Design a protein around this ligand. Structure first.
Ligand SMILES: CC(C)CCC[C@@H](C)[C@H]1CC[C@H]2[C@@H]3CC=C4C[C@@H](O)CC[C@]4(C)[C@H]3CC[C@]12C
Ligand SMILES: O=C(O)c1ccccc1Nc1cccc(C(F)(F)F)c1
Lengths: 271, 338, 225, 232, 56
């Protein structure tokens, strides 16, 4: 009861710590490169946009948790909840689709497949990422319309509606994550085939795309299953749906080499 | 006897050195003690000419001070309207390797060339509306370092074969070949009178050739490394040599010695392109460290820094009216400064 | 607006020129440029036929990839101030003839030709402009190498030798000796593969090396390493 | 360089036709094309214009909707589709090449033209003389007043002078009020002040005879003038 | 052979040595006089009013 709620609150607090650390790290190091005139490629531009979106989303989630903790009527004043849900859906859609767009950037820049359509799309990475964001704005509008649909349906007759809004947003979030997982698996497959061929003549990201997928599926099962401590499923959904904007940022820091060099510089500053 | 000839050459060199030492009493620095300093000049990028997709190696202004010809390794010369950033026409070069370009004083012809040992001269004003290759001059056994139009019919071109040549357009042959440089000739600049021109080369030497005669009138050797750029003083009685020794030097034709050097400790990199202002009080030189430095001419002082280029600056020019400075660089961005 | 009809038409012509420039640049980006180098005997011309004055350009398409080979051996001038003209070449093909281990230079016969090739390889591989440019090393003329190896040991070229005089061991030793001159081991990779006069497969090794280098460049640009 | 046209003749009114101007001798892809008109005994009138790449397709007010102007660049041809003819379009149609860059010569070459006969806020420039008897070897002046100042803020005047010899196609004489088109003798010169402009001819010859027309080029309506006729 | 090249070098030096050289002070004075005379006509040295600059 109270013990698990407090534990999940601590989990949320720690994951705020790690997510803000990672996102502030990324944004600050790229801004320092910008002001000092250092190298600014496209990958760090996308990373800046992603990190800013993630920092906004993590602040929004923690604000929802705070108004859940600071003052409860201000957590249940309805209209506040409508505005908060709308802002969160916009921000989260932007974050998840920018992550998928970065995945598309990586795949269409690195993978060396021979498919005709793959070759036809390979050379258009900026066009494809812009088109992806623009066309997924349609999914964003569709999702917003559905969110308002269920909010009106519930209010005309909200913790059960919380279990329904988490469901619909979970499905919408699973879509781009499935796209990104497919892209990453195909990219690793292409790199493995290339390595094998050239021998005849990374891991942490896979661990993420396995474990986070399993955790999100388990959360979906829980939503479809026993809903004990309904007053705490909201915070459970908060932690589970806000974990990705933190651990994925950490994966990005481990991945990009400039972020790794900046991490080494920070470690040198520590000593 | 070879030894006797070498002794005679050494005696001649000693006599030249003695004459140069006698002809100098006070350096240009000492005489310019009372001249009012230019002061720091704050220059900004008025226009940026994007469109090249490779490193830019040469850029030349037209007479009208509005048209700019830019050569890049991508294989396409681009002609820009400088007032409004517009591409007049783009010429697809046959050889993607280009290290020089020229705009004729008339404005009807554009020359280029490079590691193809070919001086490709294209005609812009054409009935057909395209830009065809009027001539493809051949005969240089080395890369075409520089090319400058004397007029619509003659072009002076320096090659890496330690030679320069004065080609006639219609005949396509070298009217006069200037030889005598020990190292590969790497840049040339014509005097305003279009009668003398000075070529600086690998041997740390700049030789002042007479176009009409065909012999080296004077040779000035004061550097210690390669000479990459050269530009006449507006008067025509002096010029500036940019070297890999990080120092420009001002050579006076009539004095025949180095008037004053331009060296500063914090800059060790080479110099790629050197130009002059219209009045001549300013020497803009494009250094190897992604920058262009504006020095005083009468004093060896840093008048300004044209920082803002991401990569190596290879071409640097000044309009005839002196209203702008194009300092195109290797990051594929011409930049107009004022 | 504040522009004339002629001015607007000029801007539109500039836009058309920009579109043509972008199309040509997109075509060239997919394209690959290679720099072919040789020293001493310079048997590269022979292997020129296997995948097929100033700069000599040979264009050839293999597996839908458009290679642009550049041969510069006829430049015969100060290399250091035109070498930077090929900054950004995908890979550098260095062809060294094994027969040069004994053949001496035409001038100053006290100097071995293979050692001259090694000096040129040091100059090019360790040059500042080619820090990120890979090298494809064809140890060609392996047939004449095999014919002549059993006459004298590699001591004539490399005294510091402690191996037999068979083709395989000597080939390994010369490959290792050439690779040892790469000071910046991590920045660039040397793809070594022995060839002969009659080889119809060298294009495959070129293609594999270029696809590896292209993937490495894409990984670096994406920031992986 | 040739721009011979094809199509025309006598047409039933209100029907439809097509005029095909064949492009040969020059890079037609990089040139804009202007269709201009010539009434049987009257002056010129701009009709239609398509730029390089067909990205700019402007029409005169009289021929909006009814007309269509297109170009087959690979085939090097210019097509003018004509719908809903009326009696005002009985005229001679010219296809005109115009390249547009700094220092260019718009309206440089004019095709021979094809004749068409059907059965039964724009700058109005004036050439009040419209007729001036001349003698060979005489300096003459030919004026063309403009309603609005053709001196644009960019610093370029936009008055064009063309000459049409009897039974021929008009040929460029002067562009931008000062510059001289290639192939024009130095005797011809132009001057103006932004509103009133005039040609000056140092010496008159047999070739100089014909009709001289003045063109504005600020707004794309591109109204010509009545023109001045030279008579020996 | 190389003797001809040495003779050519010696001759070139001989013709280069027999030229009129003026005092370095005179050369510097002429150069600074030209610099001063056209100093006011240098837009780069003294920036013109923005309205009078084509490159606004
Ligand atoms: C599949 C994963 C990644 C996504 C799940 C996270 C989503 C569905 C979560 C994160 C933020 C959450 C919201 C945060 C705050 C509140 C306010 C409260 O008064 C009602 C519930 C509501 C509106 C939550 C509903 C569910 C929610 C939108
Ligand atoms: O991180 C993602 O979401 C991702 C998605 C698709 C493709 C690549 C992705 N990231 C990534 C980040 C660093 C290194 C590598 C890899 F090694 F797989 F190439 C992949």
């Amino acid at each position: 009861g109270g013990v698990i709620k407090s534990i999940f609150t601590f989990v949320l607090i720690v994951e705020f710590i790690i997510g803000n650390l990672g996102n502030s790290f990324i944004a600050l190091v790229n801004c320092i490169d910008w002001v000092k005139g250092r190298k600014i490629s496209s990958v760090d531009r996308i990373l800046t946009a992603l990190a800013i979106s993630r920092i906004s989303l993590v602040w929004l989630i923690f604000g929802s948790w705070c108004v859940s903790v600071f003052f409860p009527a201000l957590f249940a004043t309805e209209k506040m909840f409508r505005m908060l849900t709308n802002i969160w859906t916009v921000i989260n859609h932007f974050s998840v689709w920018l992550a998928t767009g970065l995945g598309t950037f990586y795949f269409l820049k690195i993978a060396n497949f021979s498919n005709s359509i793959f070759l036809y799309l390979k050379w258009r990475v900026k066009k494809v990422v812009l088109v992806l964001l623009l066309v997924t704005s349609v999914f964003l509008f569709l999702n917003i319309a559905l969110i308002n649909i269920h909010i009106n349906a519930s209010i005309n007759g909200f913790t059960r509606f919380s279990s329904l809004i988490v469901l619909t947003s979970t499905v919408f979030i699973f879509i781009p994550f499935t796209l990104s997982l497919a892209m990453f698996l195909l990219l690793i497959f292409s790199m493995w085939k290339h390595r094998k061929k050239m021998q005849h003549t990374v891991k942490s990201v896979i661990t993420f795309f396995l474990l986070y997928a399993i955790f999100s599926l388990s959360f979906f099962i829980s939503v479809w299953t026993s809903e004990r401590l309904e007053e705490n499923l909201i915070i459970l959904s908060q932690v589970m749906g806000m974990a990705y904007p933190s651990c994925h940022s950490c994966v990005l820091i481990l991945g990009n080499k400039k972020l790794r060099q900046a991490s080494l510089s920070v470690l040198l500053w520590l000593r | 006897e070879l030894d006797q000839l070498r002794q005679e050459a050494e005696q001649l060199k000693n006599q030249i050195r003695d004459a140069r030492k006698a002809c100098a009493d006070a350096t240009l620095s000492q005489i310019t003690n009372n001249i009012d300093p230019v002061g720091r000049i704050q220059m900004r990028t008025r226009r940026t000419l994007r469109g090249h997709l490779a490193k830019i190696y040469a850029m030349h202004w037209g007479t009208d001070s509005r048209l700019l010809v830019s050569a890049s390794q991508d294989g396409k010369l681009i002609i820009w309207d400088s007032y409004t950033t517009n591409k007049v026409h783009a010429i697809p070069l046959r050889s993607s390797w280009v290290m020089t370009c020229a705009y004729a004083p008339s404005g009807n012809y554009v020359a280029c060339g490079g590691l193809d040992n070919i001086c490709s001269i294209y005609n812009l004003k054409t009935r057909e509306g395209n830009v065809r290759v009027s001539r493809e001059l051949a005969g240089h056994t080395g890369y075409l370092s520089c090319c400058r139009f004397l007029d619509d019919n003659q072009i002076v071109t320096s090659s890496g074969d330690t030679t320069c040549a004065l080609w006639d357009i219609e005949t396509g042959q070298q009217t006069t070949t200037f030889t005598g440089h020990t190292g590969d000739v790497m840049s040339l600049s014509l005097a305003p009178d279009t009668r003398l021109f000075v070529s600086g080369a690998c041997d740390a030497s700049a030789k002042l050739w007479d176009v009409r005669e065909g012999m080296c009138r004077q040779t000035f050797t004061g550097h210690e490394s390669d000479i990459n750029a050269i530009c006449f003083f507006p008067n025509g009685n002096a010029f500036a040599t940019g070297s890999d020794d990080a120092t420009c030097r001002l050579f006076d034709l009539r004095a025949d010695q180095e008037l004053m050097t331009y060296s500063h400790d914090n800059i060790i990199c080479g110099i790629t392109s050197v130009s002059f202002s219209k009045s001549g009080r300013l020497l803009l030189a494009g250094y190897d460290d992604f920058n262009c430095n504006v020095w005083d001419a009468l004093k060896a002082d840093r008048a300004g820094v044209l920082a803002g280029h991401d990569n190596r600056v290879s071409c640097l020019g000044v309009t005839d009216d002196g209203m702008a400075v194009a300092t195109g660089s290797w990051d594929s961005f011409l930049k107009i400064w004022n | 607006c504040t522009l004339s009809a002629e001015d607007k038409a000029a801007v539109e012509r500039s836009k058309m020129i920009d579109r043509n420039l972008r199309e040509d640049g997109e075509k060239a980006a997919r394209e690959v440029k290679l720099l072919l180098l040789g020293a001493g005997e310079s048997g590269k011309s022979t292997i020129v036929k296997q995948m097929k004055t100033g700069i000599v350009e040979t264009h050839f398409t293999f597996k839908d990839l458009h290679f642009k080979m550049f041969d510069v051996g006829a430049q015969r001038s100060e290399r250091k101030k035109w070498i930077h003209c090929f900054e950004g070449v995908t890979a550098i093909i260095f062809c060294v003839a094994l027969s040069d281990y004994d053949l001496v230079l035409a001038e100053d016969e006290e100097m071995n030709r293979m050692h001259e090739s090694m000096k040129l390889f040091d100059s090019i591989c360790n040059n500042k402009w080619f820090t990120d440019t890979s090298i494809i090393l064809f140890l060609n003329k392996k047939d004449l190498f095999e014919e002549k190896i059993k006459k004298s040991p590699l001591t004539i070229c490399y005294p510091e030798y402690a191996g037999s005089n068979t083709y395989e061991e000597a080939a390994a030793y010369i490959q290792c000796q050439f690779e040892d001159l790469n000071k910046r081991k991590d920045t660039k990779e040397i793809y070594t593969h022995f060839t002969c006069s009659t080889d119809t497969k060298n294009v495959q090794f070129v293609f594999d090396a270029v696809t590896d280098v292209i993937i490495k460049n894409n990984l670096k640009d994406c920031g992986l390493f | 360089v040739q721009l011979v046209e094809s199509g025309g003749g006598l047409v039933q009114p209100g029907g439809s036709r097509k005029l095909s101007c064949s492009a040969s001798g020059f890079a037609f892809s990089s040139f804009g094309m202007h269709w201009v008109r010539q009434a049987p005994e009257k002056g010129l009138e701009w009709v239609a214009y398509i730029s390089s790449g067909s990205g700019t397709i402007y029409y005169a007010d009289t021929v909006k909707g009814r007309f269509t102007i297109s170009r087959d660049d690979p085939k090097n041809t210019l097509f003018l589709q004509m719908t809903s003819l009326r009696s005002e379009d009985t005229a001679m149609y010219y296809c005109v090449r115009s390249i547009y860059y700094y220092g260019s010569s718009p309206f440089d070459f004019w095709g021979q033209g094809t004749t068409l006969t059907v059965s039964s806020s724009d700058i109005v420039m004036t050439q009040a003389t419209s007729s001036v008897p001349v003698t060979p070897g005489e300096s003459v002046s030919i004026s063309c007043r403009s309603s609005k100042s053709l001196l644009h803020s960019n610093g370029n005047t936009y008055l064009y002078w063309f000459l049409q010899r009897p039974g021929q196609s008009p040929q460029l004489l002067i562009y931008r009020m000062s510059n001289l088109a290639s192939g024009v003798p130095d005797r011809f010169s132009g001057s103006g002040s932004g509103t009133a402009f005039t040609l000056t001819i140092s010496r008159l010859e047999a070739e100089d005879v014909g009709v001289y027309y003045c063109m504005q080029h600020l707004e794309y309506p591109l109204t010509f003038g009545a023109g001045t006729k030279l008579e020996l | 052979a190389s003797i001809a090249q040495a003779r050519k070098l010696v001759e070139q030096l001989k013709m280069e040595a027999n030229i009129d050289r003026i005092k370095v002070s005179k050369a510097a004075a002429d150069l600074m006089a030209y610099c001063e005379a056209h100093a006011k006509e240098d837009p780069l040295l003294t920036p013109v009013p923005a309205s009078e600059n084509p490159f606004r």
